[PDB]
Unconditional design. Structure first.
Length: 114
């Protein structure tokens, strides 16, 4: 997870006078809206498939480059894509990696990242 190395370090410091205002704004939206479309566009298409490239480049690459500029930043983006995303499922992270983002992010972030 985003643990005692980056979260309370890089998060509490990059948050602070900065992300204490900006990260709740980002975190809550990238989750709510991304997830929105995965409620609706998953029940309409392979949007959830989109869900992946967008968020981790969009919001995780945004907020994690600042507020998790440690593991989750690259270890997720690269270290997932390759085997974490395909060694889970041959299908191409078509569910169990992508949706996992929310359970992992809200579990972890809501513990040290508002």
């Amino acid at each position: 997870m985003n643990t005692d190395v980056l979260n309370q370090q890089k998060i509490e410091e990059l948050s602070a006078e900065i992300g204490s205002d900006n990260v709740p704004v980002l975190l809550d939206i990238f989750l709510g809206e991304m997830d929105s479309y995965i409620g609706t566009l998953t029940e309409l298409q392979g949007s959830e498939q989109l869900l992946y490239l967008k968020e981790i480049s969009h919001a995780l690459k945004s907020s994690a480059a600042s507020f998790g500029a440690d593991r989750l930043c690259e270890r997720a983006i690269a270290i997932d894509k390759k085997a974490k995303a395909n060694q889970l499922q041959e299908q191409g992270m078509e569910t169990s990696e992508m949706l996992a983002l929310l359970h992992i992010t809200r579990d972890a972030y809501r513990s040290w990242t508002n």
